[PDB]
Design a protein around this nucleic acid. Structure first.
Ligand SMILES: [Mg+2]
Ligand SMILES: [Mg+2]
Ligand SMILES: [Mg+2]
Ligand SMILES: [Mg+2]
Ligand SMILES: [Mg+2]
Ligand SMILES: [Mg+2]
Ligand SMILES: [Mg+2]
Ligand SMILES: [Mg+2]
Ligand SMILES: [Mg+2]
Ligand SMILES: [Mg+2]
Ligand SMILES: [Mg+2]
Ligand SMILES: [Mg+2]
Ligand SMILES: [Mg+2]
Ligand SMILES: [Mg+2]
Ligand SMILES: [Mg+2]
Ligand SMILES: [Mg+2]
Ligand SMILES: [Mg+2]
Ligand SMILES: [Mg+2]
Ligand SMILES: [Mg+2]
Ligand SMILES: [Mg+2]
Ligand SMILES: [Mg+2]
Ligand SMILES: [Mg+2]
Ligand SMILES: [Mg+2]
Ligand SMILES: [Mg+2]
Ligand SMILES: [Mg+2]
Ligand SMILES: [Mg+2]
Ligand SMILES: [Mg+2]
Ligand SMILES: [Mg+2]
Ligand SMILES: [Mg+2]
Ligand SMILES: [Mg+2]
Ligand SMILES: [Mg+2]
Ligand SMILES: [Mg+2]
Ligand SMILES: [Mg+2]
Ligand SMILES: [Mg+2]
Ligand SMILES: [Mg+2]
Ligand SMILES: [Mg+2]
Ligand SMILES: [Mg+2]
Ligand SMILES: [Mg+2]
Ligand SMILES: [Mg+2]
Ligand SMILES: [Mg+2]
Ligand SMILES: [Mg+2]
Ligand SMILES: [Mg+2]
Ligand SMILES: [Mg+2]
Ligand SMILES: [Mg+2]
Ligand SMILES: [Mg+2]
Ligand SMILES: [Mg+2]
Ligand SMILES: [Mg+2]
Ligand SMILES: [Mg+2]
Ligand SMILES: [Mg+2]
Ligand SMILES: [Mg+2]
Ligand SMILES: [Mg+2]
Ligand SMILES: [Mg+2]
Ligand SMILES: [Mg+2]
Ligand SMILES: [Mg+2]
Ligand SMILES: [Mg+2]
Ligand SMILES: [Mg+2]
Ligand SMILES: [Mg+2]
Ligand SMILES: [Mg+2]
Ligand SMILES: [Mg+2]
Ligand SMILES: [Mg+2]
Ligand SMILES: [Mg+2]
Ligand SMILES: [Mg+2]
Ligand SMILES: [Mg+2]
Ligand SMILES: [Mg+2]
Ligand SMILES: [Mg+2]
Ligand SMILES: [Mg+2]
Ligand SMILES: [Mg+2]
Ligand SMILES: [Mg+2]
Ligand SMILES: [Mg+2]
Ligand SMILES: [Mg+2]
Ligand SMILES: [Mg+2]
Ligand SMILES: [Mg+2]
Ligand SMILES: [Mg+2]
Ligand SMILES: [Mg+2]
Ligand SMILES: [Mg+2]
Ligand SMILES: [Mg+2]
Ligand SMILES: [Mg+2]
Ligand SMILES: [Mg+2]
Ligand SMILES: [Mg+2]
Ligand SMILES: [Mg+2]
Ligand SMILES: [Mg+2]
Ligand SMILES: [Mg+2]
Ligand SMILES: [Mg+2]
Ligand SMILES: [Mg+2]
Ligand SMILES: [Mg+2]
Ligand SMILES: [Mg+2]
Ligand SMILES: [Mg+2]
Ligand SMILES: [Mg+2]
Ligand SMILES: [Mg+2]
Ligand SMILES: [Mg+2]
Ligand SMILES: [Mg+2]
Ligand SMILES: [Mg+2]
Ligand SMILES: [Mg+2]
Ligand SMILES: [Mg+2]
Ligand SMILES: [Mg+2]
Ligand SMILES: [Mg+2]
Ligand SMILES: [Mg+2]
Ligand SMILES: [Mg+2]
Ligand SMILES: [Mg+2]
Ligand SMILES: [Mg+2]
Ligand SMILES: [Mg+2]
Ligand SMILES: [Mg+2]
Ligand SMILES: [Mg+2]
Ligand SMILES: [Mg+2]
Ligand SMILES: [Mg+2]
Ligand SMILES: [Mg+2]
Ligand SMILES: [Mg+2]
Ligand SMILES: [Mg+2]
Lengths: 51, 63, 96, 76
RNA sequence: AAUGGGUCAGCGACUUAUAUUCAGUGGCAAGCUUAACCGUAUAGGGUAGGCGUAGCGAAAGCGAGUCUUAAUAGGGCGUU
RNA sequence: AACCCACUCCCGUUGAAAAGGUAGGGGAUGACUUGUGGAUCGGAGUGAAAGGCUAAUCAAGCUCGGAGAUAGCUGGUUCUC
RNA sequence: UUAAAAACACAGCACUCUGCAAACACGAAAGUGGACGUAUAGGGUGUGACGCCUGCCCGGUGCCGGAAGGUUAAUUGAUGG
RNA sequence: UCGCUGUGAAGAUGCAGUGUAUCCGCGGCUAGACGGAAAGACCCCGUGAACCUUUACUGUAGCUUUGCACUGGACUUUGA
RNA sequence: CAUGCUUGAGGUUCUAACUCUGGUCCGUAAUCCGGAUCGAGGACAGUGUAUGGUGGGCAGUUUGACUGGGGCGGUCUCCUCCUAAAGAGUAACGGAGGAGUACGAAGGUGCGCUCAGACCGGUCGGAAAUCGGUCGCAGAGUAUAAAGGCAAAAGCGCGCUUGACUGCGAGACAGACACGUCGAGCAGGUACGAAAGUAGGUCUUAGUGAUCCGGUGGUUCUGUAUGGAAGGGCCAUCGCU
């Protein structure tokens, strides 16, 4: 079943998004551009551990 | 003797000149499967419902 | 608070906030009450000579509510921006 | 018996009928699918809800090919 | 054809204390009122305290405004 | 036979009696019956064991206290327009 | 004080515990019984004169013996933050 | 303080219709007065109670393991 | 390796602590109790305190509701249709079915395109593969039940991509409350497209669990003499068949 993950900003802020994924099917990480509220720009977010 | 206020009711409701304040429920955990719009509109403080005032005021010993 | 067995309001909503212990030594004074001290000096002690504040108050701030009667001098008391204007408008100084 | 199930009712249908005065943001129809289509001055929600975007009067006209039922806002 | 009563006389069930809220009726009024306690003792004194004259915010704080926010934009609560 | 017991019928059941009587019945030198004095008791005693007995009370005595326990249950609640 | 029996006891049988300051029981403890006894004795458990007999199963749950290894308390306090 | 047939909280001395019938005892019998007696013991309910059981839960007397104390000397094996 | 001063455990021994419900003396006229002295055991036993095991011997309790009486059986939350009487709502241990997920593309946008089936013709297949033609127009498809929808296709393919954005929010629908649903518009930053524009997930309606408590990342807050810190608040998020 899908497991929760965190998406941490590449900037120095501590902002993060949250979602889930299928680890068995797609085993690589996710690199997706999102808006960072603290710096008010679109930056790249990287997968991390929910726990 | 003096009337004793309910301890847990005074930790959840605050008296103001506009009524009684409280926070919203369904915001403690299980937050990923929730929409951002739903989590954004459960964030502030609301006033007590018209039909709820009498029960809460009795617990707070305000009447 | 009983509701027949259903979860009551005082247990259905979350607790929030903390109680400020720093504000227990606080008091606010209107500009209408400034012309009630004995004479021409509004200090922390002179406010307790009248019955305008309690005996356990160390910090006092003056806010704009009403209008200042005569000219008075405030001693060690904070004032808002609007209150400070009317105090000085009616010939009163604001020192220390 | 192995049958005793049902779901809650959803309160769908027409909320404002022809000739009524409306304001922007008013919900006009609650739907599954599009029995009625959005005409002039009417928007469509992601669950096919028809809502008003202008002030005026409901019309409820049938027009065009396909024989579609339209809801529109006109001048009062 | 459900319960109670053989009859008479006597007795027998919404009270009191302390904290409060609303209404009626009074005293003072941007002020009102004292508690213990003194007392020439139902007088008079005692204004420590309580409530009101300002609110918003979880708070620091700022204040006819304030909170949220990057935002004197919007919105919540408050102000004649 | 006395004495100890209590198997059957009937009577009695507001009784002569809050467990009897008449007529029959069992044991009757024994693991017998009995007088006087003494010991063990309330979650305790004693019991050839029936949950029996512990002052006509026993799946936990009686008495006085906590105590006006608690009773979403029955019953009752008094003059007039 | 509605059940006298096929129920309880019983002589006999078996298992098991106990080396004496015994096991066991009543006692906050001192102590007392067991017993002024001593394994042919004392306690518990089942069966129930006598005759002929009492078959198979040690996987479960108990009890008894083993000590190599695994897990394991208070205690101690290396290391890191 | 009658019978019958209906009606009716659904089995009537008391209601409807109808039939019978002077007033009051005594000796007898028990068909009815849902006769008297005991706030049904069967059944269900109460966020009732007792007592009993166990590999229900949470504990506990007793029994038992080890550290420290009361608690010492010597020799030897042995790890640091 | 030798010794040295320490130090965990093991075994043996000694006597002086302790123990004796062993003997004989005294208090004494006494099978109690003390003191003395012989004998035996001996740092063991035993008691205090801390700790693991066992422990219905004993104790305080729990052991749901609906229900054509209770029990047994079944059910208990959510979605779709009928019952349901042409607005909404509407009961039964009434009649029928599904859910406790999926997807980093199965989302956004620009561009482009239409199905199932039938017949005829055509190498091994032959009713059914791929190819050509005509008819057909939705009898196909839609991640997943059923209902309502689908040509600006909401169905199918390709390029670029992250709007499955952050702060809000006029106005409504539902509604005992707590929850729920839709949303134009504004401000920041984006993505596609020449551009008007479209985009705050998926054709829609199921895919879910309050508070308390504890954990993790931030923070113009607080921080019990003072400066810190611990702890608390606020914001984000995790842990319930
Ligand atoms: Mg408190
Ligand atoms: Mg409370
Ligand atoms: Mg509470
Ligand atoms: Mg509380
Ligand atoms: Mg939640
Ligand atoms: Mg939180
Ligand atoms: Mg409940
Ligand atoms: Mg004062
Ligand atoms: Mg329906
Ligand atoms: Mg939309
Ligand atoms: Mg009668
Ligand atoms: Mg009756
Ligand atoms: Mg009656
Ligand atoms: Mg009754
Ligand atoms: Mg009666
Ligand atoms: Mg009296
Ligand atoms: Mg009044
Ligand atoms: Mg008045
Ligand atoms: Mg404002
Ligand atoms: Mg306003
Ligand atoms: Mg007898
Ligand atoms: Mg006879
Ligand atoms: Mg006889
Ligand atoms: Mg005899
Ligand atoms: Mg004899
Ligand atoms: Mg004899
Ligand atoms: Mg005999
Ligand atoms: Mg004798
Ligand atoms: Mg005696
Ligand atoms: Mg006695
Ligand atoms: Mg007792
Ligand atoms: Mg007993
Ligand atoms: Mg017995
Ligand atoms: Mg007994
Ligand atoms: Mg029995
Ligand atoms: Mg007695
Ligand atoms: Mg008796
Ligand atoms: Mg008892
Ligand atoms: Mg009491
Ligand atoms: Mg009583
Ligand atoms: Mg009762
Ligand atoms: Mg009830
Ligand atoms: Mg009754
Ligand atoms: Mg009564
Ligand atoms: Mg008998
Ligand atoms: Mg007999
Ligand atoms: Mg008999
Ligand atoms: Mg017997
Ligand atoms: Mg014994
Ligand atoms: Mg023996
Ligand atoms: Mg025995
Ligand atoms: Mg037997
Ligand atoms: Mg036998
Ligand atoms: Mg026997
Ligand atoms: Mg036999
Ligand atoms: Mg075995
Ligand atoms: Mg074996
Ligand atoms: Mg062993
Ligand atoms: Mg009749
Ligand atoms: Mg009749
Ligand atoms: Mg009659
Ligand atoms: Mg009559
Ligand atoms: Mg009649
Ligand atoms: Mg009549
Ligand atoms: Mg007669
Ligand atoms: Mg008779
Ligand atoms: Mg009779
Ligand atoms: Mg009868
Ligand atoms: Mg009767
Ligand atoms: Mg009663
Ligand atoms: Mg009854
Ligand atoms: Mg219950
Ligand atoms: Mg109940
Ligand atoms: Mg028991
Ligand atoms: Mg247990
Ligand atoms: Mg223990
Ligand atoms: Mg020890
Ligand atoms: Mg002894
Ligand atoms: Mg020892
Ligand atoms: Mg020991
Ligand atoms: Mg010990
Ligand atoms: Mg038990
Ligand atoms: Mg027990
Ligand atoms: Mg028990
Ligand atoms: Mg209790
Ligand atoms: Mg119970
Ligand atoms: Mg329970
Ligand atoms: Mg039930
Ligand atoms: Mg049934
Ligand atoms: Mg019924
Ligand atoms: Mg029935
Ligand atoms: Mg029914
Ligand atoms: Mg019935
Ligand atoms: Mg309808
Ligand atoms: Mg209808
Ligand atoms: Mg409906
Ligand atoms: Mg209904
Ligand atoms: Mg799709
Ligand atoms: Mg369909
Ligand atoms: Mg694409
Ligand atoms: Mg995206
Ligand atoms: Mg928009
Ligand atoms: Mg934009
Ligand atoms: Mg572009
Ligand atoms: Mg709890
Ligand atoms: Mg400090
Ligand atoms: Mg901190
Ligand atoms: Mg949160």
């Amino acid at each position: 079943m899908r497991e929760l993950i965190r998406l941490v900003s590449s900037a120095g802020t501590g902002h993060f998004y949250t979602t889930d994924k299928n680890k068995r099917t797609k085993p690589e990480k996710i690199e997706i551009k999102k808006y960072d509220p603290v710096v008010r720009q679109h930056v790249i977010y990287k997968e991390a551990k929910i726990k | 003797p003096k009337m004793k206020t309910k301890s847990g009711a005074a930790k959840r409701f605050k008296k103001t000149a506009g009524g009684l304040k409280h926070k919203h429920a369904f915001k403690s955990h299980i937050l990923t499967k929730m929409t951002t719009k739903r989590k954004r509109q459960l964030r502030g403080t609301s006033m007590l419902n018209k039909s709820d005032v009498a029960r809460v005021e009795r617990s707070l010993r305000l009447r | 608070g009983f509701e027949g067995g259903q979860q009551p309001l005082h247990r259905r909503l979350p607790k929030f906030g903390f109680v400020s212990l720093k504000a227990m030594d606080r008091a606010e004074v209107r500009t209408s009450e400034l012309a009630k001290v004995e004479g021409d000096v509004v200090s922390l002690q002179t406010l307790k000579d009248a019955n305008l504040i309690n005996q356990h108050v160390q910090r006092v701030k003056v806010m704009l509510s009403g209008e200042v009667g005569r000219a008075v001098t405030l001693k060690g008391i904070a004032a808002t921006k609007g209150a400070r204007a009317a105090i000085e408008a009616a010939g009163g100084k604001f020192e220390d | 018996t192995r049958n005793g199930r049902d779901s809650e009712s959803k309160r769908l249908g027409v909320k404002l009928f022809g000739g009524q005065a409306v304001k922007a943001g008013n919900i006009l129809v609650r739907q599954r699918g599009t029995k009625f289509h959005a005409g002039y001055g009417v928007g469509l929600g992601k669950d096919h809800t028809l809502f008003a975007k202008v002030d005026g009067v409901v019309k409820f006209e049938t027009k065009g090919a396909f024989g579609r039922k339209y809801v529109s806002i006109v001048a009062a």
